[PDB]
Structure 1
Amino acid sequence: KIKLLKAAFLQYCRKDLGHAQMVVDELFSSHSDLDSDSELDRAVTQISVDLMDDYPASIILHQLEDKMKAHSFLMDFIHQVGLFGRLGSFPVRLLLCEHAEKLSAAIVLKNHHSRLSDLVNTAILIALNKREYEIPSNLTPADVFFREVSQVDTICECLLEHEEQVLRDSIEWAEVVINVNNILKDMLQAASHYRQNRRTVIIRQHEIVLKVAYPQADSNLRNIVTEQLVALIDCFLDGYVSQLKSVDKSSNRERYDNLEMEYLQKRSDLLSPLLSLGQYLWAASLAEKYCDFDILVQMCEQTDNQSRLQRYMTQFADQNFSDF
């Protein structure tokens, strides 16, 4: 109940000064606790996750940095007092701490980038979710657009499609559709390196692949490459997250695990074809990123005279010969 998650949120406050007293409220917790694994332990998971949601709900950047440290001495004040169990990730809602970490480094990666075009796509993205208090206080806000920033990505995309409907593409309008590509990209670079220090999200990425495909149809050479090294930087983070979820699930209920394979395999084919017009100098890195997707790098070696590449492919491979 609410009386409990307000008692550990009170023991973490003292868990910054001393421990002894907090270690006896975790000791009173283990004896007074339920201790039936299947849901009462996911009743204290629903508490540790309701306080990670409140250390994320918390000088707007130096104030969001102070909150990635707070949620860092909150993940250390859980490892010690322990806090060595519970997990209610299920569907849509331990991986939930990391995820709320990753999205607080995303909140600081778009705080570090503040210009008039993103701040406008953000104000359009927040006025659409609800109204804002007009007692000044107009960021128009962030502390709740952090716990949910995933949404200011699918909307600062709908504000690049209405800024592309007026783009009239015309050159300065294909420079504004790349500036956003570069931010959603290095906001996905910031969640990757925060995991190294350990269906709307994805749609908005397959939507900007196709809009990064319509533009290189009319673009000065060099520019059409930098947005191609970018949509290659981004596609290599999606294929890496479907690989990591595969490896997460295995065995029984396999039927669902061989149906999600066909789905990622019909997309590394839809990202390959897309790169069939593009430069094949990136194929070598796309073929290595989803380190097999051989059918694509095998038909790039066939379209050219690089019988040297299909010999360099089979030189470093596990059963490609029986595949080629």
Structure 2
Amino acid sequence: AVVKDSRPDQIAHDDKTKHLKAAFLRYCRKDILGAQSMVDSLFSDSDMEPDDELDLAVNQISVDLIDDYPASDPRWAESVPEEAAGFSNTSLILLHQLEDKMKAHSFFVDFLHQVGLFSRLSTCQTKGMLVATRLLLSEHAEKLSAAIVLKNHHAKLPVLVNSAIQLALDKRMCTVPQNLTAADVYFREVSQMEIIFECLVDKEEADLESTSIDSVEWANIVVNVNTILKDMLHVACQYRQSKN
């Protein structure tokens, strides 16, 4: 019997990293037997002892997981960010995958906070600065919550947020043709929230400089943008206060 996960069959290293983050997601969701079976079927050993190397490895795995999407059957594998075989902005399977990733991250955080043993873990590096693995997981979960509330805003009103993300990508030089969506491109490159913030700032600056602040439509547009940012900050602060 061969126990493994479904992959869209891409690069070898990409598939290996995808299997690794899928095993990590299973370990988070407490599918210990399935994760061990898939590890013994693919590699040999993955989970080690808490140390700086393990923290860096789990940080890279979480980055790959928030950049991609887990799978198990072709139904879940069709949502992996491909090129011409899936990932076309859907508020159903993508939402379920995102909520499953969030549940796994929350369960892992709750377990590692309730075990009451943090002296065994170290502090990994992030952008040249030393941060804790708990803070890194909290930041990843905050990014996931921002993505899911952006998906909710898309399901509510898709045109405004879609045009905003498209303008941001066009300003940051990320041309998207008629095969993919700017929202899906942002979900794939979610690791650039600081760049997306500057893109929105530049978009608002262009909107204010191309007008004459004397109408109502521009005020409504800037109010909607401020409300989107308000929802982002609100869900971030809510998750942080819940994890505090």
Measured against the shorter chain, the TM-score band is: 0.5 to 0.7
Where do residues 67-78 of structure 1 align in structure 2 (5 Å cutoff)? Answer: 67-74=98-105, 76=107
With 42-51 and 94-103 compared, the bigger mean Cα shift is at 42-51
Find the aligned partners of 1:145 and 1:46 in 2 and give their Cα distance: 20
Find the aligned partners of 1:179 and 1:144 in 2 and give their Cα distance: 24
1:229-281, Cα deviation, whole Å (9 max, x unpaired): xxxxxxxxxxxxxxx9xxxxxxxxxxxxxxxxxxxxxxxxxxxxxxxxxxxxx
1:117-150, Cα deviation, whole Å (9 max, x unpaired): 4322311222343434525112352322423233
Find the aligned partners of 1:174 and 1:21 in 2 and give their Cα distance: 54
What is aligned with 1:119? 162
Q: Is the 8 A contact 1:107 1:149 kept in 2?
A: no
What is aligned with 1:102? 142
What is aligned with 1:12? 24
Q: Is the 8 A contact 1:98 1:195 kept in 2?
A: yes
What is aligned with 2:123? 87
Write the letter of the residue equivalent to 2:59.
Answer: V
Write the letter of the residue equivalent to 1:56.
Answer: I
- Partner of 1:146, secondary structure, is coil
Kindly report the root-mean-square deviation, in angstroms, between the aligned alpha carbons of the 2 structures.
4.0
Deviation at 1:178, TM superposition (A): 1.8
Find the aligned partners of 1:10 and 1:98 in 2 and give their Cα distance: 19
Where do residues 1-324 of structure 1 align in structure 2 (5 Å cutoff)? Answer: 9=21, 11-12=23-24, 15=27, 16=29, 18-20=31-33, 41-57=51-67, 58=69, 60-62=90-92, 63-74=94-105, 76=107, 79=111, 85-89=121-125, 91=127, 94=133, 95-114=135-154, 115=157, 116-134=159-177, 136-139=179-182, 141-172=185-216, 173-198=218-243
Find the aligned partners of 1:13 and 1:193 in 2 and give their Cα distance: 24
Find the aligned partners of 1:49 and 1:152 in 2 and give their Cα distance: 22
What is aligned with 2:7? none
Q: Is the 8 A contact 1:105 1:191 kept in 2?
A: yes
Q: What is the TM-score of this pair, normalised by structure 2?
A: 0.61
Deviation at 1:53, TM superposition (A): 1.3
Deviation at 1:158, TM superposition (A): 1.3
- Higher RCO (CA 8 Å, separation ≥ 6 residues): 2
Find the aligned partners of 1:29 and 1:163 in 2 and give their Cα distance: 50
What is aligned with 2:42? none
Q: Is the 8 A contact 2:145 2:236 kept in 1?
A: yes
Write the letter of the residue equivalent to 1:168.
Answer: S
Deviation at 1:49, TM superposition (A): 1.1
Q: Is the 8 A contact 1:12 1:74 kept in 2?
A: no
Write the letter of the residue equivalent to 2:103.
Answer: S
Taking a change above 3 Å as real, the CA distance of residues 85 and 7 of structure 1, as seen in their structure-2 partners, is farther
- Partner of 1:54, secondary structure, is helix
Write the letter of the residue equivalent to 1:67.
Answer: L
Find the aligned partners of 1:131 and 1:68 in 2 and give their Cα distance: 27
Deviation at 1:189, TM superposition (A): 0.6
- Partner of 1:88, secondary structure, is strand
Write the letter of the residue equivalent to 1:122.
Answer: I
Write the letter of the residue equivalent to 2:65.
Answer: Y
Taking a change above 3 Å as real, the CA distance of residues 10 and 66 of structure 1, as seen in their structure-2 partners, is closer
Deviation at 1:190, TM superposition (A): 0.8
Find the aligned partners of 2:33 and 2:153 in 1 and give their Cα distance: 43
Seq. identity, %: 15
Q: What is the TM-score of this pair, normalised by structure 1?
A: 0.48
- Partner of 2:235, secondary structure, is coil
* Bigger-Rg structure (1/2): 1
Q: Which runs of 4+ in 1 moved over 4 A?
A: 4-8, 20-25, 80-84, 89-93
